């Protein structure tokens, strides 16, 4: 009963399958948090495994560019994952409002995202669901940190060992190897980083179609291009890093470590 005794609930911030995210206050400390509230009434034993996996993965990850878990609280009928409150909103909304980022801003942005991904990979975590909605700005004040969030689809992997871990992720950001239903691992996250960097620089995605089957064909074939006029003034070094992230063959796809050494990131 630690949550009911110590915290008060306020407005909804998001929704999930069996869950809700809400601002809460730890009343005596006067400190605000975001709580994922899961209804655990007649949860499947598998769904219990998934809940404990998310909590365990979230406890592992200590990084400036990852949302911190503060507590995991089991009450009768409800479980609470208490995270930092981040008030800057989704990266998604910032990109739509500004339309696109300058190369210097996009680079600073993707640099933080890759550092968070590098940490995940070093700790044996694959997110599987990177996209602008899952990346949150630490404040509304321009220059605010990006924080990786929503490890609900994250998996634990043993070093570089890959398997068919299941079909999970978001259509626009899915890797060819996930869509083919082939074994995969850490590189699925670098593929999604490629999609996000593309969006950062021109404010629309490299893969989109009204027909989902045609969308998946385009992705599996790495069928993206750099149309005029929006790409007319973008450097080849930016195109190059995107190319290396959007490499179909996952062995030859740039790693988070390699991407952070790419001149377009490191030589500024």
């Amino acid at each position: 009963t630690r949550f009911t005794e110590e915290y008060q609930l306020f407005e909804e911030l998001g929704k999930g399958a069996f869950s809700v995210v809400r601002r809460c206050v730890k009343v005596l400390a006067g400190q605000e948090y975001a709580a994922k509230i899961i209804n655990t009434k007649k949860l499947s034993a598998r769904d219990h495994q998934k809940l404990e996996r998310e909590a365990r993965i979230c406890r592992l990850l200590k990084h400036p560019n990852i949302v911190r878990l503060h507590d995991s609280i089991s009450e009768e009928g409800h479980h609470y994952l208490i995270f930092d409150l981040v008030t800057g909103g989704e990266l998604f909304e910032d990109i739509v409002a500004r339309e696109y980022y300058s190369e210097a801003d996009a680079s600073h942005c993707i640099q933080q995202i890759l550092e968070a991904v590098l940490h995940c990979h070093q700790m044996g975590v694959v997110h599987r669901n990177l996209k602008p909605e899952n990346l949150l700005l630490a404040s509304k004040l321009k220059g605010a940190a990006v924080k990786l969030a929503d490890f609900g689809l994250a998996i634990e992997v043993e070093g570089e060992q890959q398997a068919w871990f299941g079909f999970a992720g978001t259509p626009g950001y899915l890797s060819p190897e996930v869509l083919r239903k082939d074994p995969y691992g850490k590189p699925v996250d670098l593929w999604a980083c490629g999609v996000i960097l593309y969006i950062l620089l021109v404010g629309y995605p490299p893969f989109w179609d009204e027909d989902q089957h045609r969308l998946y064909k385009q992705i599996k074939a790495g069928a993206y291009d750099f149309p005029s006029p929006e790409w007319d003034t973008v450097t080849p070094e930016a195109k190059d890093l995107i190319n290396k992230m959007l490499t179909i063959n996952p062995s030859k796809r740039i790693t988070a470590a390699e991407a952070l050494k790419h001149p377009w990131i490191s030589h500024r």
Binding site: F92, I95, V96, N129, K131, P132, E133, G152, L153, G166, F167, A168, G169, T170, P171, G172, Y173, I199, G203, Y204, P205, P206, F207, W208
Partner: peptide, 12 residues
Amino acid sequence: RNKLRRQHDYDT
């Protein structure tokens, strides 16, 4: 021309 849009996550 491709629009930036929110998309649902899947688990199958």
